[PDB]
Design a protein around this nucleic acid. Structure first.
Lengths: 137, 191, 49, 60, 239, 76, 102, 22, 448, 31, 113
RNA sequence: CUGGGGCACGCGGGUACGCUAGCCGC
RNA sequence: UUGGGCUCUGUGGGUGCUUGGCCGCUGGCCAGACCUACUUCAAAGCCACCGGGGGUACCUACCGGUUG
């Protein structure tokens, strides 16, 4: 058990995007607290000892859906400054520790592939496909 | 009236009640009771509610009225023509009615021809709920033993209720809670 | 307009999960004797060495 | 406190939570239990008497 | 030990745990699964299974849809009753009560049981609306569901009339109807309580023949026994 | 004299602190104020984020397992 | 609203539905009349018991009727109105006191 | 034993003072 | 421009986590020293900024109340109103303990608030888990009891009886009585150390190490019986207050006082101190209380007057201050502002706790839940007040939710990180500064 | 599929796991 | 002087003193109380004109008190000792008053500008 | 190639989709 | 004498001669109200209990010096 500390790393790296979103009028403070809370609980759930690919998919759906909501809302606010890069990257890192913990799930693998293909990362996609083929020939 | 201005309420030997603005010394209103077969107002007391009064006729009905609309609010065949209600007191607590002790609206009525006091639960249509039978000694004309009950107060805010009679006795009674009690138990007495 | 604070026990431990969620404030208000505790740790490092 | 580990013991050589050198092997307590007294104040009154006694013996 | 009297007053009047040990046990009391899984059953799958049973129940009977909106939504999946205010809690209690009165019909059915299990493992209905749940389960007092609930009930939380089930908690067998009726004859409060419950139901037009038959039987035998007590011989006490 | 409500500092140096002082300047340093303001920062996990902790305790040289064969081609 | 319904579904999905859960939880004229009470007025701020029943920090002299209405307000806030303030043969039988003699 | 009543505590109750009907 | 906000962020980071102003980078003459110090300053600026970003992952929200209207005011709210409006997981905690006939009661919490102690002047010691409500231990102790106080856990506690001082394990077995202290009147627990510090009636202060059980330093204050004592935990230095009218700041490294504030005309009745050590409030027999900047050693403002001599005063984590006086207690809010350099006297209290006849012996702030303990002669009373309480602890210093594992590990953490008593002074950050004199003589020997 | 549990909640040991459960000896006077 | 409260009662009309007199029921009638005071009240002393009286406290204070409401007067405090006062008395010419306080410190006070 | 440096990454209609490759806006 | 009995467990007065509840008290308050003003001048000294014999480098108390 070091689960709190590992979470401390990931959430602390999550921080400055949230700092920026606070500093923009895109979300209010109570919403912000809701967001941080939900993220922390999910990350703890991931780094729990006994974890499962369904839990992983749950979490990544949460983050990706957040990305889409953020996009829609900043579109409504007509703000062009925010990107999605950090969200997509942290999303990737979720997929990476997912395949390290459970490599043996065709379901989680194909979710990974589809995620990469919908965001446009074909070199990375070929690499991921490579590892998955290597694990399930 | 708890919130009225310089008005007092008097009752007559006739069944009437007369509102008197005591400021300029002026009779300002008079009220009459329903079914005039009821004869003489015996006792009256303001409720914890607003603008709501309890008149008690010798003829047997209690009644509680909106003393600015003069509409009956509740009517009770509450005394006999032999046994007139002669002093009442309302509980002001907040709980104690609706057969679960939670709801409010309990009142206590007393005569002076008996020594037994009576507790109504007002809520649905004003049902009876109980009788502290023979709190004081029951009065008797043939007997040397004095009896009869003078006055009853529910002291404010608390479920104690103080009774005294003729027979040199001052007792105090209280409702509990976690057993709901129809009739109280005694928690002081001096005789 | 009242609002007092509270804590769940959920905040220390989420139920269904025997991990130890241990939140970490960084207030120098909340950790006095900064350099003294640090130097003492170093002294222990040398004695351990 | 758990039984301290090896290195932590070698740091907490002089640390103990119970037997204080002022507590004097708990001689006070060991006797008081064994002989059923009700007033450790009465123990120490006994004691400073015995002390005055022994210094009389020593100066004698 | 007058101090200790005061303290145990507070500590059984507690409503939220504060050491992890009492937290884990408070979470592990449950109906369907065992404690040794319910400990680390997290708060998704509970909502999952229970909502599945909920769908079954809603497709059977119609009027469960406002309860779908208000007591089984994904935000209800993590509402923590422990930290609202009192009037909120009471409104919640009313919603809790009405749900129990509707669901107690279909009680021998597993999806209904699952629904109540959701209610317990989230809102701790067995702890904070004790008398109501005991009321709506008393009619089925012969069944394994009732014994399991009897197991998970908190003792000092049991309402003062229903305290008489404690030796059955010490010995997990269901009480029989004669035991119920005897306590019903001795006390007025239990009988008043059962009658007030079932009156609430039929005021709500949610009664059903099993419950009504139950209530009629228990009231009838109780009143028989009560007149058996009230007989005096002496004129005034009979009156 | 002293009026009301005016404090009185002892102006004496407290002898026993003189070992936790640092007597000589450290050899890379050139100013006391440079140095006393150079340390200035606790380094443990109690007073900074875990990331700054990693960055602040990283060694200058890192050695993995293996063979340090001396450098073949000049890097920069 | 200037929002899309699927966007609100997202707002449900990731931000939650906390406030909406809370809302979903929370789903004779006077017969007689006086004249002198119209004629009366009272110095509120000059009173100390009656200080607490003003509205602003400007009310001192208030007429009798309005003063009475303030007084009634304070009676309400101090002792709220009970609900019974707002036929069956057997219920009448219960409520009759003559059916209890001995 | 349950159901046997506690001490008698005078409850901190505020009532409407009536010396203001002047 | 947009960068002005970032600059403001930077300035705020420097104000908060700077712990020292900034290095003068142009002043250096060496290139190698220069580049190292630049890299240091780079890492440092980023450290401060990232911690400022980290100030979002706090979870709770600091409790408060806002009076909505112009008429009403906060010091006119009743506990009834609060317990209506408030959350049920503290409308538990509003409670009381009527323990009558064993004297006035004296209270103190433990440094995570998981447990508390109240001890009764006629000799009745009780040690409880409050919010959970299983009592730890209660004994009778016969003869009277001056002051009781937990040690480094909620395990061990201290009872200062008529003559000797005694420390008890968690089940109330008397472990051992330090007979060294005699007729102690006051105990305080300097806890990043393990120091137990006591004021005897004859003004002899003793610092006894708990862990070693060899007393470290004794001081005969050549003036006056100690009327008041409290403890600065930004520095672990003793603020004591004499009979004369002065309060003096003390350390275990000198027989003479460190400083002597002049204060109220009679005796100080009470002292209390910021946890960050900025401002110190104190109450005298002249019914004034007044405050002071500690770091600067001068008063802020004109004194306040209070309608009695306050027996006790204690302040929470945040700026609330409880002055318990006479028979009813008063809480003022903004008695000291840290961001503001110049103070302004407050019009009015935050809220009261009215006097229905409980002579207020001693008050204390429970450390992290927003309730406030009062020890009065009828018993203990726990009232609730929203503004106080640090909102967000750091679970490696203390922890209001500790399980057994974490208590064991934490006990051994503070044991390994105990502090020798010498590192105690007016400024706790002085380890590794320059010995000016000896460095001067070194430069002398080097150029000669 | 998912049914209600049964409750069955209400000294030195009886048969020996570490020796394939030799039972504790019942003590007939013949034995 | 009770533990903190200060009192002044009348004297009772004695059956010795009235010619046709009787034992009353409630023989004392309570004139004034005073809660202006913060600790034990350890000595009290009347004036010689029976119009003022001095209260020497246990909290280093003394107070002057009016029998009845004088005109050119405020009931007033006197402070400054180091350990609580034991005695306080009027002068014969009731201008100066003395206090004598427990660590052996006698203070003579006048009412000057 | 985490070697360094450079370009681009959102919503509209177009040239065009069981699709997105291009022109100008927002 | 138209139920009896043991044992347990609560509440209430008593078990010491009857003058009210509260507060910033010569008044007010029990629905409370106003809530932070005002200031010429820090301080007089002493004593102040740990069991005995024993050592004493360091810390401290004292006493006597020494440079600055």
């Amino acid at each position: 058990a070091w689960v709190a500390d590992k979470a401390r790393f990931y959430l602390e790296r999550a921080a400055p995007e949230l700092r920026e979103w606070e500093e923009k009028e895109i979300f209010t403070k109570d919403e912000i607290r809701n967001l941080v809370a939900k993220r922390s609980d999910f990350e703890h759930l991931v780094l729990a000892p006994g974890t499962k690919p369904t839990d992983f998919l749950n979490y990544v759906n949460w983050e990706r859906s957040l990305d889409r909501l953020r996009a829609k809302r900043c579109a409504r606010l007509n703000i062009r400054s925010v990107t999605s890069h950090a969200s997509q990257a942290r999303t990737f890192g979720i997929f990476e520790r997912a395949v390290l913990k459970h490599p043996g799930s065709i379901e989680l693998w194909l979710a990974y592939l589809e995620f990469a293909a919908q965001v446009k990362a074909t070199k990375r996609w070929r690499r991921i496909m490579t590892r998955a083929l290597r694990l399930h020939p | 009236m708890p919130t009225f201005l310089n008005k007092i309420f008097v009752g007559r030997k006739d069944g009437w009640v007369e509102i008197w603005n005591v400021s300029t010394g002026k009779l300002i209103y008079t009220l009459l009771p329903p079914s005039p077969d009821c004869g003489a107002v015996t006792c009256l007391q303001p409720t914890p509610a607003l603008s709501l009064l309890a008149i008690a006729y010798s003829g047997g009905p209690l009644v509680i009225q909106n003393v600015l609309t003069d509409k009956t609010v509740l009517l009770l065949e509450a005394g006999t023509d032999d046994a007139p209600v002669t002093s009442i007191s309302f509980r002001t607590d907040g709980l104690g009615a609706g057969q679960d002790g939670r709801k409010d609206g309990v009142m206590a009525t007393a005569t002076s021809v008996s020594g037994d006091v009576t507790f109504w639960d007002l809520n649905k249509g004003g049902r009876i709920m109980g009788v502290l039978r023979s709190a004081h000694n029951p009065p008797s004309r043939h007997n040397i033993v004095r009896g009869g009950i003078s006055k009853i107060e529910f002291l404010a805010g608390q479920p104690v209720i103080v009774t005294s009679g003729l027979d040199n006795s001052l007792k105090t009674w209280i409702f509990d809670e976690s057993p709901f009690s129809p009739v109280p138990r005694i928690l002081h007495q001096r005789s | 307009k009242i609002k007092a604070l509270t804590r769940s026990i959920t905040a220390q431990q989420a139920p269904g999960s025997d991990v130890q969620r241990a939140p970490r404030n960084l207030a120098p208000e909340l950790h006095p004797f900064e350099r003294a505790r640090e130097y003492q740790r170093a002294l222990n490092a040398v004695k351990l060495e | 406190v758990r039984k301290l580990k090896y290195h932590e013991q070698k740091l907490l050589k002089k640390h103990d939570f119970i037997n204080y050198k002022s507590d004097n092997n708990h001689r006070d307590h060991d006797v008081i239990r064994r002989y059923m007294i009700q007033k450790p104040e009465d123990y120490h009154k006994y004691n400073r008497l015995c002390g005055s006694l022994r210094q009389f013996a020593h100066r004698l | 030990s007058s101090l200790a009297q005061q303290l145990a007053q507070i500590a059984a009047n507690s409503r939220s745990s504060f050491n992890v040990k009492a937290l884990k046990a408070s979470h592990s009391k449950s109906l369907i699964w065992e404690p040794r899984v319910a400990v680390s059953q997290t708060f998704a799958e509970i909502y999952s299974q229970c909502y599945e049973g909920f769908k079954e129940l809603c497709h059977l009977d119609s009027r469960f849809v406002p309860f779908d909106a208000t007591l089984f939504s994904a935000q209800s999946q993590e509402v923590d009753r422990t930290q609202m205010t009192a009037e909120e809690n009471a409104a919640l209690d009313k919603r809790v009560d009405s749900f129990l009165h509707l669901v107690g019909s279909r009680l021998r059915l597993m999806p209904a049981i699952k629904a109540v299990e959701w209610l317990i493992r989230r809102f701790r209905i067995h702890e904070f609306n004790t008398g109501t749940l005991l009321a709506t389960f008393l009619p089925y007092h012969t069944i394994p569901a009732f014994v399991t609930l009897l197991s998970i009930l908190p003792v000092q939380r049991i309402p003062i009339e229903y305290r008489f089930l404690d030796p059955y908690i010490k010995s997990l067998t269901p009480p029989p109807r004669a035991a119920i009726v005897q306590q019903a004859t001795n006390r007025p409060d239990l009988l008043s309580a059962i009658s007030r419950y079932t009156l609430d139901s039929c005021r709500a037009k949610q009664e059903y023949p099993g419950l009504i038959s139950f209530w009629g039987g228990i009231m009838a035998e109780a009143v028989n026994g009560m007149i058996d007590k009230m007989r005096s011989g002496r004129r005034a006490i009979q009156l | 004299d002293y009026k009301l409500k005016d404090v009185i500092i002892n102006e004496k140096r407290v002898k026993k602190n003189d070992k936790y002082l640092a007597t000589g300047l450290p050899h890379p340093f050139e100013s006391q104020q440079q140095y006393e303001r150079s340390l200035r920062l606790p380094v443990g996990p109690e007073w900074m984020t875990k990331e700054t902790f990693q960055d602040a305790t990283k060694p200058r040289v890192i050695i993995k397992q293996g063979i340090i064969a001396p450098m073949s081609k000049p890097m920069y | 609203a200037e929002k899309d319904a699927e966007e609100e579904e997202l707002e449900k999905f990731v931000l939650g539905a906390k406030e909406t859960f809370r809302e979903q939880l929370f789903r004779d004229a006077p017969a007689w009349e006086d004249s002198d009470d119209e004629r009366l007025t009272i110095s509120l701020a000059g009173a100390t018991r009656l200080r607490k029943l003003r509205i602003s920090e400007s009310e001192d002299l208030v007429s009798g009727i309005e003063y009475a209405r303030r007084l009634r307000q304070q009676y309400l806030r101090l002792y709220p109105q009970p609900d019974w303030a707002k036929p069956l043969p057997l219920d009448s039988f219960l409520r009759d006191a003559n059916s209890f003699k001995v | 034993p349950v159901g046997m009543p506690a001490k008698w505590d005078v409850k901190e109750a505020r009532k409407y003072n009536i010396e203001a009907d002047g | 421009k947009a960068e002005l906000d970032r600059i403001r962020r930077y300035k705020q980071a420097q104000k908060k986590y700077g712990r020292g102003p900034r290095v003068d980078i142009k002043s250096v003459r060496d290139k190698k020293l220069r580049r190292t110090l630049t890299n240091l300053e780079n890492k440092y600026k980023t450290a401060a900024l990232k911690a400022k970003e980290a100030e979002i992952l706090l979870e709770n929200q600091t409790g408060f109340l806002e009076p909505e209207g112009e008429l009403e005011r906060t010091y006119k709210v009743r506990q009834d109103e609060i317990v209506k409006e408030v959350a049920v997981e503290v409308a538990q905690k509003k409670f009381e303990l009527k323990l009558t006939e064993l004297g006035p009661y004296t209270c103190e919490y433990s440094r995570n608030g998981r447990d508390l102690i109240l001890a009764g002047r006629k000799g009745h010691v009780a040690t409880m888990d409050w919010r959970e409500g299983k009592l730890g231990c209660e004994l009778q102790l016969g003869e009277t009891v001056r002051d009781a106080r937990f040690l480094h856990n909620n395990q061990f506690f201290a009872v200062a009886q008529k003559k000797y001082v005694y420390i008890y394990d968690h089940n109330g077995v008397e472990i051992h009585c330090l007979r060294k202290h005699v007729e102690v009147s006051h105990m305080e627990f300097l806890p990043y150390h393990f120091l137990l510090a006591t004021l005897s009636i004859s003004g002899q202060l003793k610092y006894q190490d708990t862990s070693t059980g060899q007393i470290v330093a004794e001081i005969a204050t050549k003036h006056g019986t100690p009327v008041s004592l409290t403890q600065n935990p930004y520095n672990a230095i003793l603020h004591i207050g004499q009979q004369n009218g002065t309060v003096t700041l003390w350390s275990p490294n000198s027989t003479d006082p460190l400083v002597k504030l002049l204060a109220h005309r009679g005796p100080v009745r009470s002292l209390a101190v910021d946890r960050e050590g900025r401002y110190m409030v104190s109450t005298g027999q002249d019914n004034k209380m007044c405050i002071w900047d500690i770091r600067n050693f001068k008063e802020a403002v004109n004194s306040y007057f209070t309608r009695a001599p306050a027996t006790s005063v204690a302040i929470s984590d945040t700026g609330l201050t409880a002055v318990g006086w006479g028979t009813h207690t008063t809480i003022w809010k903004g008695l000291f502002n840290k961001e503001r350099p110049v103070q302004v006297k407050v019009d009015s209290p935050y809220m009261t706790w009215g006097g229905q006849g409980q002579v207020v012996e001693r008050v204390r702030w429970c450390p992290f839940e927003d309730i406030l303990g009062i020890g009065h002669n009828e018993g203990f009373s726990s009232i609730i007040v929203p503004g106080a309480g640090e909102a967000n602890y750091d679970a490696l210093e203390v922890n209001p939710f500790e399980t057994k594992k974490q208590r064991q590990e934490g006990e051994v953490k503070a044991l390994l990180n105990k502090l020798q008593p010498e590192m105690i002074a007016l400024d706790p950050n002085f380890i590794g500064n320059l010995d000016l004199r000896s460095e001067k003589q070194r430069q002398a020997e080097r150029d000669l | 599929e998912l049914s209600v549990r049964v409750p069955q909640l209400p000294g030195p040991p009886d048969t020996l796991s570490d020796w394939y459960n030799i039972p504790r000896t019942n003590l007939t006077p013949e034995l | 002087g009770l533990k903190r409260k200060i009192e002044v009662w009348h004297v009772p009309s004695t059956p010795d003193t009235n010619e046709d007199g009787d034992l009353e029921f409630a023989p004392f009638v309570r004139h004034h109380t005073h809660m202006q005071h913060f600790d034990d009240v350890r000595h009290l002393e009347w004036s010689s004109d029976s119009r003022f009286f001095l209260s020497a406290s246990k909290d280093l204070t003394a107070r002057i008190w009016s029998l009845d409401t004088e005109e050119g007067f405020v009931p007033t405090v006197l402070s400054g000792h180091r350990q609580g006062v034991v005695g306080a008395y009027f002068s014969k010419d009731q201008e100066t008053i003395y206090t004598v306080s427990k660590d052996g410190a006698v203070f003579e006070w006048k009412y000057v500008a």
